[PDB]
Structure formats: C-alpha cells, structure tokens
Amino acid sequence: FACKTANGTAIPIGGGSANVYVNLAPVVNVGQNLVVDLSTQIFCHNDYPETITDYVTLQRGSAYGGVLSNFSGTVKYSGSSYPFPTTSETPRVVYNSRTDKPWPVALYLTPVSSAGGVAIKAGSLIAVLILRQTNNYNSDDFQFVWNIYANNDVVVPT
Numbered sequence: 001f002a003c004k005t006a007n008g009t010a011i012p013i014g015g016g017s018a019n020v021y022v023n024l025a026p027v028v029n030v031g032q033n034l035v036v037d038l039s040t041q042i043f044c045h046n047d048y049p050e051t052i053t054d055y056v057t058l059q060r061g062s063a064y065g066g067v068l069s070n071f072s073g074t075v076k077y078s079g080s081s082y083p084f085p086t087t088s089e090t091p092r093v094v095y096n097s098r099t100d101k102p103w104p105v106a107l108y109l110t111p112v113s114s115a116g117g118v119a120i121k122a123g124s125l126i127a128v129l130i131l132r133q134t135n136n137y138n139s140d141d142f143q144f145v146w147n148i149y150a151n152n153d154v155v156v157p158t
C-alpha cells in the first residue's frame with residue numbers, strides 16, 4: 001500500500017510524510033465556503049489485493065496558518081462530515097485494487113467574521129492530515145502524513 005499525489009510526490013510502503021501544494025480559490029466572501037478537495041490530488045493503491053485488504057482512515061487532521069487563524073470548517077471523509085480540526089478517527093475506506101483510488105478527503109472552510117484581506121498567505125502551511133493504513137494480514141499500522149500548502153493567496157474581501 002503506497003500513495004502518490006497528482007504532482008508525483010510519493011509516500012511508499014510503511015508510510016511517511018509528503019508536502020502537497022494546492023491551488024486555492026483567490027477570493028472567498030464571509031459565509032461562502034472554501035474547498036480544499038484532496039480527492040483530486042491524493043491517490044492510493046493496495047500492493048497485493050489478491051490476499052490482502054487495506055483499511056484506511058483519517059486518523060487526525062489539524063489546521064495551521066491562515067486557516068487556523070481565520071476560518072472555521074469541517075472535513076468530509078468518504079461522504080460524511082466531521083469537525084476540523086478532527087476530534088476522533090473516522091470510519092475506514094477499503095482499498096483492494098492495484099489501480100489508484102482517491103483518498104476521499106475534502107475540507108470545507110468558511111471565514112470567521114473577523115476575517116479580512118489576505119487570510120491565507122501563498123506558500124504557507126494550512127493543514128496536516130494523517131492517513132492511517134492497516135490491513136487484514138498483519139500488524140501494519142502506518143501513518144501517511146500529508147502537509148498541505150497554499151499555492152496562492154486567498155483574500156476575504158468586505
């Protein structure tokens with residue numbers, strides 16, 4: 001079981017860390033949502049599906065930088081909503097193909113009422129998401145750490 005981004009950045013068997021750069025929407029007004037859709041960007045396969053089934057959760061997600069300072073939000077995992085920052089581990093997604101499948105994670109962020117001007121600086125860390133991978137085979141308990149970076153600024157006008 002290994003993951004790669006669209007960019008090419010990989011985390012191999014046994015897990016690891018990666019830096020992921022997302023284009024964000026340049027402008028977001030108060031009570032509009034900012035979406036960080038990582039299901040278009042992070043992908044994962046099972047390396048031996050014939051006899052092994054991989055089980056993947058969002059263990060932990062935390063907010064940094066502009067998102068920590070001037071956005072409240074939720075995370076969507078596999079079609080359900082959870083608080084962000086995350087208060088618990090989610091239900092598991094099954095991976096049983098050698099073909100890449102999205103990691104089904106998106107953030108729904110909305111500016112707090114304080115927020116104005118540049119509220120996310122380009123190049124800044126905005127989140128760290130921990131994919132936890134297990135299987136029906138042995139004790140493997142691997143962390144795939146995704147460190148999410150803004151490619152661009154985000155302005156909250158008013």
Ligand SMILES: OC[C@H]1O[C@H](C/C=C/c2ccc3ncccc3c2)[C@@H](O)[C@@H](O)[C@@H]1O
Nearest residue numbers: 001002013014045046047048052054135140
């Ligand atoms: O995705 C399945 C597994 O992939 C690797 C270990 C791989 C096992 C294996 C075992 C016997 C094999 N026999 C013939 C050819 C290949 C073989 C591969 C880890 O990421 C693990 O955490 C994950 O569950």
